[PDB]
Design an enzyme around this catalytic site. Structure first.
Site, PDB file in Angstrom:
ATOM      1  N   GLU A  35       0.821  -1.212   0.000  1.00 12.25           N
ATOM      2  CA  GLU A  35       0.000   0.000   0.000  1.00 12.25           C
ATOM      3  C   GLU A  35       0.854   1.261   0.000  1.00 12.25           C
ATOM      4  OE1 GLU A  35      -3.081   0.373  -0.430  1.00 12.25           O
ATOM      5  OE2 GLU A  35      -3.980  -1.583  -0.031  1.00 12.25           O
ATOM      6  N   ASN A  46      -7.819   9.032  -5.448  1.00 11.58           N
ATOM      7  CA  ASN A  46      -8.637   8.040  -6.165  1.00 11.58           C
ATOM      8  C   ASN A  46      -9.525   8.725  -7.188  1.00 11.58           C
ATOM      9  OD1 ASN A  46      -7.763   5.877  -4.363  1.00 11.58           O
ATOM     10  ND2 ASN A  46      -9.064   6.808  -2.831  1.00 11.58           N
ATOM     11  N   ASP A  48     -12.707   8.640  -7.623  1.00 12.47           N
ATOM     12  CA  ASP A  48     -13.922   9.241  -7.070  1.00 12.47           C
ATOM     13  C   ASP A  48     -13.712  10.542  -6.316  1.00 12.47           C
ATOM     14  OD1 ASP A  48     -12.901   8.388  -4.608  1.00 12.47           O
ATOM     15  OD2 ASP A  48     -14.462   6.922  -4.234  1.00 12.47           O
ATOM     16  N   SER A  50     -11.828  10.893  -3.568  1.00 13.46           N
ATOM     17  CA  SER A  50     -11.319  10.631  -2.234  1.00 13.46           C
ATOM     18  C   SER A  50      -9.791  10.458  -2.341  1.00 13.46           C
ATOM     19  CB  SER A  50     -11.981   9.423  -1.610  1.00 13.46           C
ATOM     20  OG  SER A  50     -11.625   8.262  -2.311  1.00 13.46           O
ATOM     21  N   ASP A  52      -6.371   8.377  -0.309  1.00 12.93           N
ATOM     22  CA  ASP A  52      -5.864   7.389   0.647  1.00 12.93           C
ATOM     23  C   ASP A  52      -4.654   7.932   1.399  1.00 12.93           C
ATOM     24  OD1 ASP A  52      -7.771   5.584  -0.395  1.00 12.93           O
ATOM     25  OD2 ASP A  52      -6.270   4.475  -1.490  1.00 12.93           O
ATOM     26  N   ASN A  59      -8.867   5.464   3.403  1.00 14.60           N
ATOM     27  CA  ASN A  59      -9.585   6.328   2.476  1.00 14.60           C
ATOM     28  C   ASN A  59     -10.482   7.372   3.146  1.00 14.60           C
ATOM     29  OD1 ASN A  59     -12.404   6.378   0.813  1.00 14.60           O
ATOM     30  ND2 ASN A  59     -10.644   6.319  -0.589  1.00 14.60           N
ATOM     31  N   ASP A 101     -15.104  -4.592   9.946  1.00 13.40           N
ATOM     32  CA  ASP A 101     -16.274  -4.027   9.247  1.00 13.40           C
ATOM     33  C   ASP A 101     -17.105  -5.014   8.414  1.00 13.40           C
ATOM     34  OD1 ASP A 101     -17.758  -1.588   8.701  1.00 13.40           O
ATOM     35  OD2 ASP A 101     -16.924  -1.604   6.662  1.00 13.40           O
TER      36      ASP A 101
HETATM   37 NI    NI Z   1      -6.950   2.460  -2.189  1.00  8.76          NI
END
Ligand code: NI
Ligand code: CL
Length: 129
Positions: A35, A46, A48, A50, A52, A59, A101
Site C-alpha cells: 500500500e 482516487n 472518485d 477521495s 488514501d 480512504n 467491518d
Molecule cells: Ni486504495
C-alpha cells in the site's frame, strides 16, 4: 517516516495487530509494504475524488476527514492528516475498525491482490519480535 520491515512488524505487534481478527502479523506487514512502501507520509488520490492516507492507505470517503471529500462519513473520527504521523497509533486504531467491518482485510486491494494466499510469514522472518 519510512519504516524498516522488522521495525514496522515490532511496532504493529506492540499496538496489538498480531492475530487481530485472526490476521497474523505478516498479513499486516505485507499490506503496508504494497500500500505505502512502509512510508507513513504516502498519499494517493482516487478516481472518485477521495484520497488514501498513510502506511495503510486509509480512504477519506469512509474513514477520515480531509475537508475535500463531500459526503465523507469519518468513521474513525480523525483528520486524515493524523494518519501520516511517524507514530502509527492512529492508523492502527483506524485499521482495527476497518478490518472489523465485514470484509476483513479484503478492504485493502493490495492485500487481496498481492498478499492473500501467499506465504506472508516471510514478511516477519529474521525479525526480533
Ligand atoms: Ni486504495
Ligand atoms: Cl475475516
Amino acid at each position: 517516516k519510512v519504516f524498516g520491515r522488522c521495525e514496522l512488524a515490532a511496532a504493529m505487534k506492540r499496538h496489538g495487530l498480531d492475530n487481530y481478527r485472526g490476521y497474523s502479523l505478516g498479513n499486516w506487514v505485507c499490506a503496508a509494504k504494497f500500500e505505502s512502501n512502509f512510508n507513513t507520509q504516502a498519499t494517493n488520490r482516487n478516481t472518485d475524488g477521495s484520497t488514501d492516507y498513510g502506511i495503510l492507505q486509509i480512504n477519506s470517503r469512509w474513514w477520515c476527514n480531509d475537508g475535500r471529500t463531500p459526503g465523507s462519513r469519518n468513521l474513525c473520527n480523525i483528520p486524515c492528516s493524523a494518519l501520516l504521523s511517524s507514530d502509527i497509533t492512529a492508523s492502527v486504531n483506524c485499521a482495527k475498525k476497518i478490518v472489523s467491518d465485514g470484509n476483513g482485510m479484503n478492504a485493502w486491494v493490495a492485500w487481496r491482490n498481492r498478499c492473500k494466499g501467499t506465504d506472508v510469514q516471510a514478511w516477519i522472518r529474521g525479525c526480533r519480535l
